[model samples]
Target: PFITVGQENSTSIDLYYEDHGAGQPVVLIHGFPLSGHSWERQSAALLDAGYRVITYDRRGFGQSSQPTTGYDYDTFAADLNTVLETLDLQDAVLVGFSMGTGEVARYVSSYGTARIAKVAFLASLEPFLLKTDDNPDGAAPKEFFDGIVAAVKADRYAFYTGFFNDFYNLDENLGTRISEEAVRNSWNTAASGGFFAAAAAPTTWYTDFRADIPRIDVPALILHGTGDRTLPIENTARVFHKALPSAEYVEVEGAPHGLLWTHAEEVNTALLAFLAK
Candidate 1:
């Protein structure tokens, strides 16, 4: 069953979710500017493995309510918690992709990991991205994020085309890694999320989760690709790997940021193996 997890006033929004299979719950949080539908491959595999799978579009993405505000991590994390409590999910494995990884870490840090048994960050953005005085070596600059906002605000269609290409490494690998149809399918799914969410997507880079990463109490699985050009393994996964002592890090060779779909079988195998432990 899928239900709307509501809040008060203008902040209230309906999070469209899908609940499938039976047994232990495994919630899938989709990336920014995309819906839970992005997890069709992983969801089907997990369902066949006998675990109940849950995937949902965040407040401003896909079929969920697209509010003008509340795009911050705090609100995103709260919406996730509301969904879990509303559905009474316990000891579940929360799997997060791209920006969704922030929701996973922030949820555990904010609400505690009582309902969650394990956590996995696939092509995650965490620890920190922007360079600061306290922590240097952060790859992206303020202008980098601002440029994304400008580009998205100017021409989202063009922005997404280039983004999807870079995200899936379409320029380099092309048909070998992901086909033209796969890239188009990903673009359409992302474009369907609308303007506000697309514009707000760049602001996510402003978030600094350095403190939040250590707060994660449960066993964490961190997976990334050596060839990920988007978030890069050094700035994203390596930072997370360094912070959490209990985290198991796996770096896939020649895998891009879109490994969730491009490398579905490998991703599924890693996830199922993690869940089995």
Candidate 2:
């Protein structure tokens, strides 16, 4: 179903969402450069397991209407709030991957945990990622992130090749963990998004979520791959676990950042087991 969430100055950013099955709701928020369509396998698995599954495109990706503004975490969280409110979903479990983790953090802190029941962060960018004097666990420096946006702006098509390479650890064995079709689908998905949103979204990654982590009271599952280079395990999941000490944490050995695809069976088993409790 399509949701009309935003309207300002005669402009509306319509969001595309899919609701499946009927049970406790599971909302999956995708990472930067990818839309809700990236959760295909996870949605099917959750649906088959009898949990209601909801997946929606971000403002500038997939079936959603792309707007120049509203690419920040605050706006993204607002969009997620609109989805939950429109569907009237309660006791929902939020599964956020990569950049989507920012939305989860901001939403929990800003909206509080009235509707949310649990949360799962995978290859997450939590707490903070910018290397600064105030924090030592940061993954990369401020200039490092800015360089990414510049690279994306310069040659986005070429950017996908390298980005997806590191994403799935292609140099090791691209075909083994993920298929050619999987890569193609991801490429197609990335290509479908608006350039302005794509280029601007990374700037929001450096936003500190440390303040938000303490505000989260719901049960959380933190999963990160040991070999992740995209967000880095130490800077993200490890730091996240330290902040949210109550969360169930798992470190997938030798897995890449795209653990959702590279380690779907491992990830799904953990998801079902967590949700079962």
Candidate 3:
């Protein structure tokens, strides 16, 4: 109920964003099947650290409107750039997760780091989303990612559950269930925006981001879960680390992609350090 929504008439996509705290600018971007709410834990910590934290639901997710078209890296980045431009954000830090990473990369390349001061790709799909001859480390074998597109078209409900499990590698640790809330929230959002999200999933996943990484000449931090099965932490973090200039890579040992939620302290500490510098 606290979510605020906006519309980009140019793209016909409704955007939902929440701004919190007051200090430096920090934009938190959520990944597939999840909404801006996914950053609640991180946002709370960022806010407490005296930074302006902004989290938003991309087109077709959360409370955002699902347009019939306009699902691509350019569109996503355009939406993000519009938000920052509208707010007149300067020297801002952009933190992106999974698909959101695409938006960050394209934004920096297109608009340069003048407006964006630093970037953190958290459990993000970087360099490229698909495997190719040059980028063997890329993700979701052509057929595999394609199957997801088809599956979503068929049984979206089950497709979302499957993607959730694959993305987070949800483990049942009775003692530490905080991550469960994140997963549940993601699940709920996925279900509510099923069709539209499913339609946009392909755009977020298969889009080529290889040419988009090296162009980002800004302070970059790469965060990935060691046990991340969805995007393969090695491929996302390591590959991007090598390509990006002055990028620091951190591995969340024994953590899954959901570690961002379960291991908020570590993630927050690392993020705060980056923001401070």
lDDT of each: 0.85, 0.89, 0.78
- When sorted by TM-score, best at the front, the candidate numbers are 2, 1, 3
Error of 1 at 175 (Å): 2.2
lDDT winner between candidates 1 and 3: 1
Give the alpha carbon lDDT tens digit for every residue of 1-277 in model 3.
Answer: 2232344566445577888889999999988777888888898888888999888888787888876566778878888888887788998999998888888998988878888889999888887767778778877568877777788888887777767776666654323735566667677888877485665577467677777786878788988888787888767788777877488888877677766776778888888888889
Q: What's the lDDT for candidate 1?
A: 0.85
Q: What are the runs in model 3 whose C-alpha is more than 4 Å off?
A: 1-12, 172-182
User: lDDT per residue, candidate 1, 43-142, as tens digits?
Assistant: 9999999999999998778888777777789988988988888999999999999988999988998888889899999999887888677767576778
- The better-scoring model by lDDT among 2 and 3 is 2
- How far off is residue 40 in model 2, in Å? 1.3
RMSD (Cα, Å) of model 3: 2.7
Q: Which has the higher TM-score value, candidate number 1 or candidate number 2?
A: 2
In terms of TM-score, which candidate is strongest?
A: 2
Tens digits of per-residue lDDT, candidate 2, 74-180, equal: 89999999999999989999999988888888999999999999999888998898989998899888899899999999988889888988888888747898988
Clash count, one per candidate: 0, 0, 0
TM-score of every candidate relative to the true structure: 0.95, 0.97, 0.91
